[PDB]
Amino acid sequence: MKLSGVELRRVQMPLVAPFRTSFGTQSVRELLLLRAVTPAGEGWGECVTMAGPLYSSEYNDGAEHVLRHYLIPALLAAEDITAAKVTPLLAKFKGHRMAKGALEMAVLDAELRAHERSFAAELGSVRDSVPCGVSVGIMDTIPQLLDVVGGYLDEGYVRIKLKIEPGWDVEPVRAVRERFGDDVLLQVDANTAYTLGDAPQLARLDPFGLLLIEQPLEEEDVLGHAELARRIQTPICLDESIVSARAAADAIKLGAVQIVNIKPGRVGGYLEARRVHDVCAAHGIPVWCGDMIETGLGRAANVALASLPNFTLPGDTSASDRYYKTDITEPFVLSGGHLPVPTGPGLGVAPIPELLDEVTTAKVWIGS
Amino acid sequence: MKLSGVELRRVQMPLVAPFRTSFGTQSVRELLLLRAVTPAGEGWGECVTMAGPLYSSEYNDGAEHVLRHYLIPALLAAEDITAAKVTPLLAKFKGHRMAKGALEMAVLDAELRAHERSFAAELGSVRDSVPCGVSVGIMDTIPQLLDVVGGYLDEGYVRIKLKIEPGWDVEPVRAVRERFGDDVLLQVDANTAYTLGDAPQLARLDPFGLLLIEQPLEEEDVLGHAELARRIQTPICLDESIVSARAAADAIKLGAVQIVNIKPGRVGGYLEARRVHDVCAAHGIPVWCGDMIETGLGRAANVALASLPNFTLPGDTSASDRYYKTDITEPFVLSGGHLPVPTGPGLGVAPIPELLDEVTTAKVWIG
Ligand SMILES: CSCC[C@H](NC(C)=O)C(=O)O
Ligand SMILES: CSCC[C@H](NC(C)=O)C(=O)O
Ligand SMILES: [Mg+2]
Ligand SMILES: [Mg+2]
Fold first, then answer.
1. What is the distance between the alpha carbons of residues A118 and B79, in angstroms, rounded to a whole number?
2. 3-state SS assignment for residue B340
3. Distance in angstroms (rounded) separating the CA atoms of residues A61 and A77
4. Nearest by CB to A55, which of B94, B220, B254?
5. Which residues are recorded as binding Mg(2+) (chain B)?
6. What is the chain A residue with the closest CA to B219?
7. CATH superfamily for domain B1-115+353-367
8. A92 close to B (CB below 8 A)
9. Whether B263 is catalytic
């Protein structure tokens, strides 16, 4: 198509329950949505950034700005657009992966709808539903965590993942293991909150049979993770460090990772995400799908992505009401601990206009 | 210090001549300056960022935004403050190294002025003056290049560095070797423009005894360079990959670099730049000072940095007049292929208000 313009929206949605990680506390989600307009039809992208630069350097105001003054203008100046051409057209601009993948997701969605083809079919889905886990924040007390972990297990979540940070690690997993025992799929995630100095502490998690420990060290610190691997029993999983398919190939070559978390926005797009999936598959490295507290737009695309063959561990693609009282799309709802892969053209879902409007804070049109 | 506030201002300065790298051409230089203000006095800082995210992901408006909504408020909220404590206070915020480095510089310069100590003293200077090199852009034609380098040599620049890119690589260096011969110190700089697939092409630079090749491959591709070093004779130098002392430690362990270009802003500040120097010194890795076309404030801090003991290759830190008709500061002027280390307390220079104001585009106070 040609790319007529992009409508860019800021959306603010109430969380059902405040969410705590090693980097802060959230109780509302502020996000950007993009509607790409083409002669052939519309498409939706969700940008995975947050309000400030706390998980990575990208954040809502920054992504809005690059999108509006560099990325979108570049795509608008282009003679031809396809989703694959987006990467080369924007290659001149360094970084901004999450912004780049928002835009690419919107162009992809417009392009597949026009061909009445699924995100799933495009990506190479091989199954119709996917097992879902849940990610449980840091709590103020051990019993609160216990009640909470008890809730999700009763709803049928198939695996539990505990946010951790210095001072909240060995106690919480021991608690969880004493209460629900050893058969429960359990893993932890530090969000870069430890250093190689903490290896003796993190080895105190050996005896608990965790599936993985996710990104214990800082995003640039790849050799560090290869080092840590040599000193702990729990397999290492990278999240923030995997910023591209090449990144994953390097981390694997260096013995820095055994299991990869794929998050599309963080790698610059669904298309690059599939490439991470294939690089990992070629080296024997299982992957699992990550979550950025997306609305139904992103959730739909992630559930599609999670259905690819090398997703061998349950992901973080929980049901909508894990985060949101009211999703802007048809919500995802757990069933036998699975979510079903969407079926129509494109994303397989679309915003319900009235619910979107209720949550829209700002709206802006970028054309020529 | 308790920190009162920071006056952040945008500055635009014209360039003596178009400067063209592998990512595009530039003819003005838009930059941000920072004025930290304490109850004692003030300090200056310069952000090395450009107008768009072409050299890295950071850019003028981005830096302005973080500085204003995150970086500076975090400083003002804090009790006592020191340059060293800036890092832990800003750590919370992922990336934005150049932004953080400007604000750190500005705070350093305040701390230091109150202690009547210069940058050179604080950083560990061992020399009074430093030798300088010149960086030469991509030209339209071979003779237009030879001409420009001819000129630079005569001005007395001790070394030449040539911008390169596919289509402008072996020919220009061949040309420069014929006109000026084997004895001039010569290096090239790709700014990211090749891939490992272009190895045979870059091996073609083997015959010409280049002292290094700066950043042939992408920023994120450290393993790539280790691989390249095995297929070419020219020593590899990294610029954009080196974002911190840890990054240099890692590039050196993986055998991905033989020589390291230090840029204070790129790496998150002068305090980190020193660390990078020291990690590189500890591994026998020579370093040389880079240049981001700074004003005189940036240049004054660079010349102090470039006088640490391990800076043993000539820096990119040219004289004020290489970029600017008029500099907002007493200009730096090439004397014997050298520049002199500033001598005043702190940065040892200050912007002269008559000229700053000529060149300021906008200005905001943050209290
Ligand atoms: C508040 S950031 C969301 C990032 C996501 N965590 C959640 C637990 O799915 C990832 O860090 O695993
Ligand atoms: C304005 S472009 C970035 C600046 C710097 N080059 C010049 C040669 O000093 C770097 O490429 O080494
Ligand atoms: Mg994570
Ligand atoms: Mg360079």
1. 55
2. strand
3. 23
4. B94
5. 189, 214, 239
6. A94
7. Enolase-like, N-terminal domain (3.30.390.10)
8. yes
9. yes
